[PDB]
Design a protein around this ligand. Structure first.
Ligand SMILES: [Zn+2]
Ligand SMILES: [Zn+2]
Ligand SMILES: [Zn+2]
Ligand SMILES: [Zn+2]
Ligand SMILES: [Zn+2]
Ligand SMILES: [Zn+2]
Lengths: 153, 317, 74
């Protein structure tokens, strides 16, 4: 909770100055340092310029335990749960190095969104759809993502 | 700089023990010329020994890495790191030596290895001993015993004869300003992990990493090594082969590491724990035998599968 | 110097023993104060069984280290 929270704070500081276009609107509630709020704008058409609000809660053992991520904005995606939970290989406790920076994980999440992976689905129905039929998937995708998610210039 | 003055005991070949206190900056030749009139031996005769090396006559007393109430020996002839039981925080350690046969000190060592060397093995170096009129012989035995080393805590007063501490060979002073993996924070004192990449961590992270992998019984098991920890990066074949490093964590944090390691050993080796409340004694019952007793305990009888009272009929639920 | 042998119950027993003593010696002391058969005793420290032939000094047992006891019916 010392070399943990301070590293977390240092990562946050570097993320703030690195105002990368894809991840904007950082909201770190001053009360709890272990929880973050964010807003992500994908460049790709299935989730075109539609900002999705995510929340990142870090464990009290942050340096040695992978953080979990939830989606407060509903999203039509195979690797994303209905509750909003996300299966990111970089996160999963089976293969997570402590040195892995937060921004590298966020960039990995973005890449996961732009190009979904049906190899390991949390939501099987959507995975079978995208693998077999893309155009009808994209229609349902874009329709839903214009229906939920706040656009940002 | 508290006192500066040092007090030291002297134990020679003869049973007499001499208590002499000196200023840290006197010549050893001068010390030789002080010990000699002390017992009545000639100044030219005395050879002083300490931790194995034939002491230089010119070298300064302070130079010898010597604490308080330590022991030196004479005769007529002519950056470490340890964990202390008294001192919870690890302290700078000193290296002393004892004979295998007579379990005593005051002997010359042939090798005198500096650092980063082959060490900590029962059989390594033979040396001449002063005690018992030079009667430490291996010539008769055949089976070879050797001069073995030991460490003492150098932050406090010590009991010269048998005082010892646990050596933490994986802790080094950060000589190249190497950053800790976990916090990217260059710590003066850090730990070096056994993997090829030589990953390093500081003490705070060694504690947080340990106490996080502890509550859930996540220590990796290796039969010879023991229930140790993998590399923070999870590098292969990087298991801490000397467990005593865990003592950086205090009583509760460390003592529970002993308990869990015992419980998990019993479990995997085929043993069963006692289900009567507050017993938990693990009894290694012969694999075929299915009657569970509690040797020197609560004697409640069980079935291996059901965790209930001794039933004759098979436990379906 | 002294050590602690601990049954999982919590029953802590204090035994005086010196580093250059075999496990067999410790096993013989534990049983004299309690009554255990010599063979039934398996001493375990940090999850590894202690070999009867070797000594405490080979495993670097400190002052007041906890040597948990495990009983082998056999
Ligand atoms: Zn000490
Ligand atoms: Zn000797
Ligand atoms: Zn660190
Ligand atoms: Zn490594
Ligand atoms: Zn019992
Ligand atoms: Zn049963």
């Amino acid at each position: 909770s010392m070399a943990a929270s301070r590293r977390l704070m240092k990562e946050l500081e570097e993320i703030r100055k690195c105002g990368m276009k894809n991840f904007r609107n950082i909201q770190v509630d001053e009360a709890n340092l272990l929880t973050w709020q964010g807003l992500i704008v994908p460049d790709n058409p299935p989730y075109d310029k539609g900002a999705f609000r995510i929340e990142i809660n870090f464990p009290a053992e942050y340096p040695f335990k992978p953080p979990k991520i939830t989606f407060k904005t509903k999203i039509y995606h195979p690797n994303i749960d209905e509750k909003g939970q996300v299966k990111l290989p970089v996160i999963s406790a089976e293969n997570w190095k402590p040195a892995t920076k937060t921004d590298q994980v966020i960039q990995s999440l973005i890449a996961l969104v732009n190009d979904p992976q049906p190899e390991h689905p949390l939501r099987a129905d959507l995975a079978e759809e995208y693998s077999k039929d893309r155009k009808k998937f994209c229609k349902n995708a874009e329709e839903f993502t214009k229906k939920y998610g706040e656009k940002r210039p | 700089y508290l006192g500066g003055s040092l007090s030291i005991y002297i134990k020679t070949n003869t049973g007499r023990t001499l208590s002499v206190n000196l200023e840290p900056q006197w010549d050893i030749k001068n010390v030789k010329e002080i010990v000699a009139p002390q017992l009545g031996l000639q100044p030219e005769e005395v050879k002083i020994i300490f931790a194995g090396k034939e002491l230089s006559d010119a070298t300064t007393i302070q130079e010898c890495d010597l604490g308080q109430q330590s022991i030196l020996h004479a005769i007529r002839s002519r950056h470490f790191f340890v964990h202390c039981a008294q001192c919870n925080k690890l302290c700078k350690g000193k290296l002393r030596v004892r004979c295998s046969l007579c379990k005593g000190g005051a002997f010359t060592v042939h090798r005198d290895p500096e650092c980063w060397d082959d060490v900590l093995k029962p059989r390594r170096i033979t040396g001449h001993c002063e005690s018992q009129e030079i009667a430490c012989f291996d010539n008769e035995t055949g089976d070879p015993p050797f001069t073995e080393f030991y460490f003492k805590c150098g932050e406090h007063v010590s009991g010269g004869e048998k005082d010892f501490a646990a050596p933490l060979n994986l802790i080094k002073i950060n000589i190249k300003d190497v950053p800790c993996l976990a916090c990217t924070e260059v710590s003066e004192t850090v730990l070096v992990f056994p993997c090829e990449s030589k990953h390093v961590t500081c003490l705070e992270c060694f504690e947080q990493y340990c106490r996080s992998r502890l509550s859930e019984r996540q220590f990796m098991p290796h039969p010879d090594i023991g229930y140790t920890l993998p590399c923070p990066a999870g590098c292969e074949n990087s298991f801490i082969e000397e467990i005593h490093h865990f003592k950086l964590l205090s009583r509760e944090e460390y003592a529970r590491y002993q308990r869990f390691a015992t419980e998990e050993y019993v479990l995997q080796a085929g043993g069963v724990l006692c289900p009567q409340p507050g017993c938990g004694m693990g009894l290694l019952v012969e694999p075929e035998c299915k009657k569970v007793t509690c040797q020197n305990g609560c004697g409640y009888v069980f079935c291996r599968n059901c965790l209930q009272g001794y039933h004759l009929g098979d436990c379906l639920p | 110097m002294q050590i602690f042998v601990k049954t999982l119950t919590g029953k802590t027993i204090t035994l005086e023993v010196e580093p250059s003593d075999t496990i067999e010696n410790v096993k013989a002391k534990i049983q004299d104060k309690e009554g255990i058969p010599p063979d039934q005793q398996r001493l375990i420290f940090a999850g590894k069984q202690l070999e009867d032939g070797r000594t405490l000094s080979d495993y670097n047992i400190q002052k007041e280290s906890t040597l948990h006891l495990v009983l082998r019916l056999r």
